[PDB]
Amino acid sequence: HMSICTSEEWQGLMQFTLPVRLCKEIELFHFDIGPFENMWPGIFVYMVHRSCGTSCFELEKLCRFIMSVKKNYRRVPYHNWKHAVTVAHCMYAILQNNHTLFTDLERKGLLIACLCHDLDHRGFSNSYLQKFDHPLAALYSTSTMEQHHFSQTVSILQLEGHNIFSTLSSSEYEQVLEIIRKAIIATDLALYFGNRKQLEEMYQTGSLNLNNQSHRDRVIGLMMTACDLCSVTKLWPVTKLTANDIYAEFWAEGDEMKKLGIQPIPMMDRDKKDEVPQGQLGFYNAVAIPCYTTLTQILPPTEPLLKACRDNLSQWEKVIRGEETATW
Ligand SMILES: COc1cc2nnc3n[nH]c(C)c3c2cc1OC
Ligand SMILES: [Mg+2]
Ligand SMILES: [Zn+2]
Numbered sequence: 001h002m003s004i005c006t007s008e009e010w011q012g013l014m015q016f017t018l019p020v021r022l023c024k025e026i027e028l029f030h031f032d033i034g035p036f037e038n039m040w041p042g043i044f045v046y047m048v049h050r051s052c053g054t055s056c057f058e059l060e061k062l063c064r065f066i067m068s069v070k071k072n073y074r075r076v077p078y079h080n081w082k083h084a085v086t087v088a089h090c091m092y093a094i095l096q097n098n099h100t101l102f103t104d105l106e107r108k109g110l111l112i113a114c115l116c117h118d119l120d121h122r123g124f125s126n127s128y129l130q131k132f133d134h135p136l137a138a139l140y141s142t143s144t145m146e147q148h149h150f151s152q153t154v155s156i157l158q159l160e161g162h163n164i165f166s167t168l169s170s171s172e173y174e175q176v177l178e179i180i181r182k183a184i185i186a187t188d189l190a191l192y193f194g195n196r197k198q199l200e201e202m203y204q205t206g207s208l209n210l211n212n213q214s215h216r217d218r219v220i221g222l223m224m225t226a227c228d229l230c231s232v233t234k235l236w237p238v239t240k241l242t243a244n245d246i247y248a249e250f251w252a253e254g255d256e257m258k259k260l261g262i263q264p265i266p267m268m269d270r271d272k273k274d275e276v277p278q279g280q281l282g283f284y285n286a287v288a289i290p291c292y293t294t295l296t297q298i299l300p301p302t303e304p305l306l307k308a309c310r311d312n313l314s315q316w317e318k319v320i321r322g323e324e325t326a327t328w
Contacts, residue, residue: 002155005067013063016042029093029304032238033085040085041066044115047092051099051107057164065112065162072119072152077248079121088114090230090305094223097301101210105172109179110220112153112164114227116180117187119152121145123249124256126188132260143188150184179220186221187228192287195221196294203297219298226295226305232288233308236315237326247276277319284313 018026018039025031026043033040044066048056073081091114095107102110126144129137140147154177157163165176186195199218202208209215231242254268266272267279292306318324 002152002159003068003071004159005064005071009067010060010063013041013045013067014059016045018042018046026089027093027096029090029302030234030308031089031093032234033082033089034238034241037082040081041070044085044088044111047088048108048111051092051095051111052104056104056108058167061161061164064159065156065164066115068156068159068162069115069119072156074121074123076121076123077252078242078245079118079123079249083118084115086230087117087227090114090227090233091223094227094299094302098299101299105168105176106179106220108165109176110183110223113180113183113224116153116156117146117149117184117224117228119149119156121149124253126190128253128257131262143185143191146185146188149187150181153180153184182217183220183224186224189225189228189287191221192225192291195225196290199294199298203294208298222291222295222298225291226302229288229291230305232284232312233292233305234312235308236312239312239315243276243280247273277316280316281313281320284309284316289313 016039022036022039022043023046026046033043036043041063045062048062069084070081073079073084088111091110095102095110099107124134126137128134129144136148137144157165165173168176185191195218199208199222202215202218210219231246232239234242250268251270254264254270257264257268263269266275288309289306292302292309296303296306315324
């Protein structure tokens with residue numbers, strides 16, 4: 001089954017008011033939610049209301065959905081509740097800077113898909129679950145975890161007083177759930193590589209057309225990747241601290257593989273930390289920089305994500321040259 005929020009939890013969220021100083025900061029792509037843990041459910045409510053209006057959801061149902069989503073994220077080093085809210089905030093900023101390019105239905109579906117995209121993550125990759133024939137790999141052949149995250153999202157909506165979409169007409173309901181399903185599967189990085197090459201060719205040739213549903217799905221797919229990886233778009237100390245959380249989870253998986261008699265890939269090996277600055281360089285060159293370059297060409301208002309990603313690539317290159325200061 002699914003874990004449920006207490007009455008105190010969602011009632012506490014209903015009376016949450018955001019500090020006026022934060023209303024300005026939240027609009028910016030570089031916004032770091034890190035220092036405001038007590039306000040994270042409240043920041044999501046504010047985002048929903050700012051993106052889709054104050055009445056888009058029955059306030060009571062929205063607060064219950066949010067606090068139960070929080071309760072079904074695990075205490076893992078990276079794929080946790082903090083990650084969900086960070087990903088949802090990047091989607092908010094993208095949607096605010098390109099608001100009428102997207103319909104009300106898409107905005108509702110995308111913000112909720114971002115909050116739910118890693119629901120019940122156990123801190124183990126698709127490679128681990130496949131390699132060690134976990135039941136999840138038998139149920140879901142490809143994009144194993146992502147198909148499980150969506151399955152988890154539908155289950156929360158299926159709880160009493162949690163279906164925030166039950167008031168949509170029969171047709172827009174099916175439409176929103178499909179927007180959500182496609183958004184969550186798109187967060188499987190395996191699919192990103194093909195998605196970005198298909199989008200780049202459509203852009204360079206001028207065939208890219210947002211009124212074409214297949215094109216719309218791919219653009220939303222790239223937006224999902226862009227949000228999922230947005231830790232590489234923050235101010236350098238935030239980017240570096242999240243990288244510590246990301247590697248703490250990879251090293252725990254690698255530790256599990258060594259217990260099983262299998263040498264992990266160097267990236268998951270805590271005895272190979274000297275290889276991290278070069279691995280980040282490879283990740284930015286092959287994954288991050290291309291993602292934001294393509295997203296920027298399609299949606300010019302997202303240029304700050306690209307700019308910030310280029311600045312963080314410079315910082316990683318400074319680490320390799322032994323020019324870094326600070327720490328902590
Ligand atoms: C900050 O560097 C990284 C960020 C990441 N974020 N999400 C990820 N999902 N799956 C993978 C493999 C991710 C990943 C990898 C990174 O370096 C290798
Ligand atoms: Mg994921
Ligand atoms: Zn994620």
